[model samples]
Target chain A: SMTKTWTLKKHFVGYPTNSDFELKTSELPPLKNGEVLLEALFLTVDPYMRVAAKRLKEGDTMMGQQVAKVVESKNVALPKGTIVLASPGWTTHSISDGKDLEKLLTEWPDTIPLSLALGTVGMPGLTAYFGLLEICGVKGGETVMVNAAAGAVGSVVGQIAKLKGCKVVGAVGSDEKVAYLQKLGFDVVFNYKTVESLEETLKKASPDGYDCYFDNVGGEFSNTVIGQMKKFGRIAICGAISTYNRTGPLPPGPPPEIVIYQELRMEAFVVYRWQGDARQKALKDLLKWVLEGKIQYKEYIIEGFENMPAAFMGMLKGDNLGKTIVKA
Target chain B: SMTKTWTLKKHFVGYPTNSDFELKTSELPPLKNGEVLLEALFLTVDPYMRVAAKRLKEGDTMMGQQVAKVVESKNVALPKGTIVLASPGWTTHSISDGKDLEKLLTEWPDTIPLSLALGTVGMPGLTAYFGLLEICGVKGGETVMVNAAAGAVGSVVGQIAKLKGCKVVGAVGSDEKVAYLQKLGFDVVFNYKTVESLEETLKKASPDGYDCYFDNVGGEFSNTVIGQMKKFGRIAICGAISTYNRTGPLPPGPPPEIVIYQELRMEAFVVYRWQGDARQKALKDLLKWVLEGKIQYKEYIIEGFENMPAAFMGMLKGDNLGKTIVKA
Candidate 1:
């Protein structure tokens, strides 16, 4: 039988222009024991894709995760009609030996929508969960300010910080997103581009000085928020979307000695850091929030499998308000 | 009874010139129920003084500690015969209500030499102690690197790293001090001026990147050491001597992304961060090391109380072999 696939043609340096990638089709090998033949339903695009794509070689599928349906399975655990999530990047159909699929589906219970396993209930959700609670350690009555407020991780981080009784402030790229975060019950939200001074806007939002900063855009936005931090502040270094597109090396900016004087600490981590016990706690708490309507979830769908590249690019450029997913 | 004192006439921008200070004699009132008159004995000429002096106002006595005699005391808690360490700055005599003195002397046992309380047994020792164990968290079998290796803090840092079973490497100003650190059983030693590339020296000394970096000099030297650190490396920042004498701002260097990527955690401690339980533990351990001869202690004493400024300048210039002290 024939299978549709995409091979990475060449690595794009700095910001990936559309020209760096190539698409192709190939035939699938027959399924073996414990194997499941799945058809892709939706693909989730995130910033890490751009970084991983830059690092991987010319002829590998651009790495990412997608929600899929098991059309056929030799494995008893994942029978036919079973929905699953897998990192079969840029592929419409594939055969997984149930190893990767089972691991990917670890915490995903059958009750929730399967698409969440690729977006909010999956890696990005786990990333925001642990990054906020474990790394930032948001305390009750403390303030947590996050950039990319309307995006997947930022939105969840703000909600979780609120669950911990923190005053959450979110900074978004546009006015509409500011309103969207406000609707999510964020204590304070701002369109950073329209603000006169980031320092002033932050002061107006949280006059007490941010006790925790969950940084997603690690350039000038983080810099401004850092200045507004109180003593003993914690910064979770999750992502740096602002500088990802710049062609040259990341140029040095302001000194972070304010972090020293204020006794602030920042640390970065992937989901792998706290996947075992901590992520279980995060997912359970997040699910509880979802059931109670305290936490909101949103997905920006760019329909059709062939348009995955454009969706990925748009996500990186802040075009999407939520988890940018390509529905097949 | 009158006491003569030198006041901080002006803040020093660069290396303090004579014009930055002024000496004054003032009349003193009778001691209150809790107060005591202290006559100067030996003063501590420390590098921290130079940094603190830049923040002093026109009439603030330059910040420092001095061993002083309790000539008269109304408070029965501390008798007149007591010799206590007082941060009298550039003062000949001062009045402290024995409260601070009692606490200072309690920290230093009677058997320990009074001068050791000013050098190896006091603040600098504690700085070296907790900075290494708690901040750096140097574990046995790992490699530790220190800059300003023969100074008051650095000298103690190397010895403690050794006691902790770390492979200790030191970078000092001269060959003589290289011999000194060698006597302390440092696994590797080099002169910072003689080395072409600190990163290369570290590579040769530690094929795997250094695990714990105790940085005293915090510009290019600290940067090089940080660059050569293994993932999840810890750094204890006691002083940034390299950036201290600058007329203006810190020079531009590597981007902050390197810090996040290497997962290197650099922490600057004022010794007050862990003042409760950690300080007590560090003090007890330091005293034990001194009593057992597990650690050697030495000092470069500049004669005369009037030469306090000169002694402070010498230490800042890295001229002292060990702890720099001034005898009155």
Candidate 2:
């Protein structure tokens, strides 16, 4: 039998092009003892793939996770037909030895779609949970500004901040995303480009300065936002999509006066760092919120395994409304 | 009786000039009910005065602290011979209500000079103590980098970090200060201006990267030092003398990607904020260190009240080796 995978053909100099990757078909060997043959259901296309690309070389499988089905399993715990989450990269079929396999919550309330196992109830959702609550410590009446607020982790961050009683402001790349997040109950949504001045717009949106910042975009954007942070403000540094594509060194940030005079704190984290009980608790809370219609999720899904590169590239260019994924 | 005071004649546009201030002789009124007359002994010229100049208007006395002798007092606790720490601005003689006067530690070891009541055993020492011990939470065997390392606070920070079993690196503006801090037992000392690459030089100095940063100089120097910080590093933002003279917006800092990637923490603080037991404990520890000769202090004494503006401007230009003071 054959399995399809996307392989990096060369290092992406700046903005990644489709030519940077090559889709190839490879033979799938018989499953060894205690191993399972998995078939991909949905593939995740995210900004992290761009970060991963930096260390990856030619012919490496693009690093990513996906929702997969256990088509044939020797492991009793993860039997045939069980849907699990696995880091299969951009692949249509995978073989795993039960390692890194996360079984979806079977008892999840049916009102919430199963696809969310890759989204709101998945890595991105847990990221928003821990990054906002654990890192930023969002509290009532505090104002939070989320950069890349229209994306997967960010959208959830805004909603969670809102639910936590924080005034949530979002910075997106387009006017359309601005409208979508508004419907999701964001206090203020501004297209980062549309504003005459990023500082002025953020100042007007959060008159008293942001108490907490969910930074998905780093660099000058972060610098400007940081300048407007209140005393003792907390900034959770999650991603820097703006600098991801640049081949050169990351640009300098705004001066340290704001961090010093305002006593602002900025911390960066990867979501998986909170994988044990914390991740479980986050998923439980996230699932409950989704079932109650308190949290809304949207996916910009591209169908077909062959289109994975396009989907990944598009997500990097801010072409998606929410979580960008691929259906295989 | 008459008192000589330095008053702001104009706002400092960029670098402070002697013309920005006016030397005035004013008549002293008869003592009020609780008022005590203060004769300035040593006036402190610190980096904060430059920052304070921003909010101060023309005709305001140049903001500063001084060790003064109580010449006359209605308050029983403060006698004519009592030496006290007072915020008497840039004045040779002034009248206080005993309200702003803090009696010097009479129990201090005779070996520790009274002039230190304005330097190492005073605000700058306490600044290093709380800023390093409390804020940075310095642990033994950690590596700390002190910017503006020849100044009062930075010198003490290096010594204390050394006493705590940590390796200390010092970044100063002049080669002379480098030798001075090295003699004070800094593990690594670099003249920031002489270094072709601040980052490279810092990395070579402390190959393992810094664990804590006592930042007295902000802007590009800070940005470069921050790049070489280890994961979970803590920065104590004490002062930004580099930016104190600038008239425009503060310059951009180094990209925050390092802070995010390393999960670094930076906090700005004023020592006075940690008052009561914390302040007393710090002062007690500092006094003991000074008496034991575990800590050394140096003051660049510019003689005469007339040299006050020269002392201040000279300190801003990095002319002082340690605490810059004017004896009036």
Candidate 3:
């Protein structure tokens, strides 16, 4: 058997161009002891892929997580035909030991689709869960401002803040996403790109100032919002999607004294940092919310594994709302 | 009785000048039922004074803490000639209701001079104790760096870290102060102004990167040092003395990604934030250190009440080696 894979032919410079990646095929090795064959069903195309690319060499397989079906298994824990989450990268089929197989999702309710294992109830969901609740500690009646509000992790963050009775405000790129987020019960939504003034819009949207800022886009936008944060506010620095492709110097930001005066706490984190029981707890809560319709997720599905590179590039350019997925 | 007070004649612009203040003599009111007459013996001149001036109006008494003699008191707890710590501002003599008096040092050891109630064993000492121990939570064998290490608070911070078995590094303004800090047991001392590359100096000093940072000077220096911090490193943002006098826009420094990548924690605090039992406990421990000669302090005493403004200005210019105090 053979597996299709997207390989980085050249490192990205500025925005990632299609020429940087090439699709290739490699023969799969026979299953060794304790090894399983994962056939990718749905794969994630995310901003972190752009960041992870910087640390990787030109010939590296593009790193990503995917929801896969265990077609054949040597481990008892993951039997044949079981669905599990794994980091199979941008590949149609890959071999993994029992160690990398995440939750078997054996009890995943029939009402929810299995593809969510890569999205709403998966990595992005867990990222939002821990980053907002654990990091920001969002409380009832407090105001929260989320940047990249229409993206995978951010969409969940704003909804979670709302479910907790906090005022949820979002900054997104397009007006359609603005409308969509507002309909999702966000108290206020502004197109960050078209807004005349970010500070003014934020001040007006969250007149009381943000008690927690779920920052997915850092740089000048974060600095401005940081200056406007209330005393003792918390910022969860999840990602810097806006600057992911920029090769130049990061812009000047608010003075460090702003953090000093406001007594704000900002923490940067990747979702994988929280694991074991914490991951289980977050996934349980998220799955329950999804089942109850308290939480909603949208996926921009780019069909076929051949278009994985294009799907990733499109996500980088903000062409997709919520989670971006490529179906193999 | 007539009391001499230095009043703000104008809000300070840039560096505080002599013209910004005016000395005035006013009649002290007769002591009421719970009132006491305080004769200022030693007044503190600190960086906070420069910060406090920004919020104060013209004709307001310059705000600061001082060690005073209760020349007369109607309250039994604070009797005549009792030496107490009080916030009498820049005044030779004033009347205070018993409400504002911090403490009556009746059991103050005879071996320690009374003036120390305004120096090492006072606010600066407590600031160092809590800012290092409580905020940064400095532990034994950790590497610690302190900015403005020659100043009152910074001087005590380095010493306390040493007592806790930490490798202490200090950044001072002058070579003389560098020698002084080295003699006081600082493992490494650098004149920040003369250092060719702060990053290189710090890298060489703490090859593992600083575990705790006691920041007195904010702005660019902080932004730079923050980049060199190890994972989970804590920074006590005590003051921004370096930018206190600058009226223009603060210079941009390193990117915020440094904090995110390093998982650094920066907290701004005033020593007074820890009060009551915590303050008392720190003071007790500090007093024990002072009596045992484990802690030492130097005073830049400007004699005569009329030189208060000059003393304050000089202290801001970093002319003072330790705590700057004005003797009345």
Candidate 4:
């Protein structure tokens, strides 16, 4: 049996340059009992990739979970020709036992798009779902502020905030994103490019300070919007995508006094924090929203396994809306 | 009878200039039914005053409560020569209807230093007590990090954190303050200026990161120390003396991100927030600590009522140890 994999070519100091990764050809050992090899059909490219790998050293395969078609199997549960999901990171094929496979794919997929498992049905979707609902405690009649409103996680977060009867406001980098955010039930969508000041815009939209601030861009934008939070307001600490991939040290200007004065509650944790009870509850609710067409979504799909880096970097540059994915 | 009153002459812009206030003479008003004339023998100079007065307009008597005595009384329940506490900032005398007076002073005082009603027995003492135990929930066998350690509230805060069995680490302004804090029964004390790095010093002394952070001198020092906090650390935000007299707008720093990343329970509330049942319970505990010798305290007395401005400014500058009082 053979498997083609993308190996970590080099360690990145800061922002991952294309040169940091290498598409290497590797052979897979035969599957023992309880093991199966799947051909990756759809791969995901997410912002969290940059964060996870920076903390993890090089020489390890880059981290990503892909939806694959069971091509050959030794495991009785996962027979050949069955569709499954596995975290085989920027690869064209995967070998995993059902134990590791269950995390990415549950029992079987129904009418929900299998590609949604690579996105809104999987981790990124769950990240948006629980990050807003659980971390920020999005409640009805409250106001929520989300930066990066047009991105994959941000868009869903905004829709979820709206679904909960809260006024959802979004700020995006471009006019098209602004329109897209409004279509997704954002109460007030702003094109930050033309905005005179982020804080001023937030204050205008949320006369009473933001009840829950879903922070994605953790630079000046978060510094400004979180500052406009009402007393006892909550903030969901998602990816600080703005500063996450900086090649140099963090850029200046988000003054630290705002957090202290506002007495904001900001928490950052992996989705697994609420895996047991909250995740189950959140997924049920998110699935319902999807079924009802409440959560409008999108996907930026790239062709071929070799285009993973391009897709990944494009997502980093805010070029992709919804979940950025690559098709094998 | 002739009486002298100090009035806020003008609104302060930067670090309150000397011309911001003016003293005037007027006849002391007669006490009516249920009213008592209080001759202020001790005036409090608190750090909160500097922060509070920023919102005060010109010609508003400073907003603070003080320990005063009844010179003449018309009501039988409030007889003449009775001691009382009132918020008549810088004024030589005031008239009270015995409301909120029962908080710090019970049966007035025989010889227990009526000044304590404005000092340890007054607001700053209660501020330190409730803010630490209630807000931070300081526990035994844990470490507490406090900045402005030798100042009025910090000194009391350190002692209380100690009384609760916490290993109290104080960051004082000078070596003298370090020595003073050490004598105040702090487990560890260091002059913040002498340390190479605030985080390094705190980590070296208390490797477990502070369980509770009582902030007074909030700035870069606090930001560094806070970054080292363990999970679920509590921060009681009382005052930010470092930014009080900033000749200009604040210089940028790292304090805000520290609050968010640590998921730190940071609360900044005026003692007024918990004045009802919470205040009563905390006061009883504080009184018990005082009577049982579980806590030791000091007084920074700036003699003469006329020097209230100087004393007020000095207290805000972190000059006082324990409570700052102006003796009339």
Better of 2 and 4 by TM-score: 2
TM-scores across all candidates? 0.90, 0.92, 0.91, 0.89
| Overall lDDT per candidate, in order of appearance | 0.78, 0.85, 0.85, 0.73
Off by over 4 Å in 3: A1-3, A9-13, A24-34, A71-80, A139-141, B9-13, B24-33, B72-77
B1-328: candidate 3 lDDT, tens digit per residue: 8999899999988998889999999998799887889998888888888877878888999998888888888978889978778897898888888777788444578876677777788888888998899789987989998999999899999889988899999999998899899889999999999989988998999889989999898877887788889987888878888787988866664565676677676777777677788888788888888877788788777899899999999999988887788888
CAPRI grade of model 1: acceptable
Instruction: For candidate 2, write residues B1-328 as lDDT tens digits.
Output: 6899999999887888989989999999988777889999888888878877878888999988998888888878787888888997899888888876787665776665577888898998999998899789997999998988898889999999888899988889998898899889999998988889887888898888888989898888888888888878888888888887777766665565566678777777777777777777788889888777789888788899998999988988987788887888
Candidate 4 local Cα displacement, residue A99, angstroms: 4.3
Clashing pairs in model 1? none
Candidates ranked by TM-score: 2, 3, 1, 4
DockQ: the better of candidates 3 and 4: 3
Candidate 1 matches the true fold with a TM-score of 0.90
**Tens digits of per-residue lDDT for model 3 on A251-298?**
654566677777777777768778778888888888989988899878
Provide the global lDDT of candidate 3 against the true structure: 0.85
**What TM-score should be assigned to candidate 4?**
0.89
Off by over 4 Å in 2: A246-252, B9-14, B195-197, B245-252
Better of 2 and 3 by TM-score: 2
TM-score of 3: 0.91
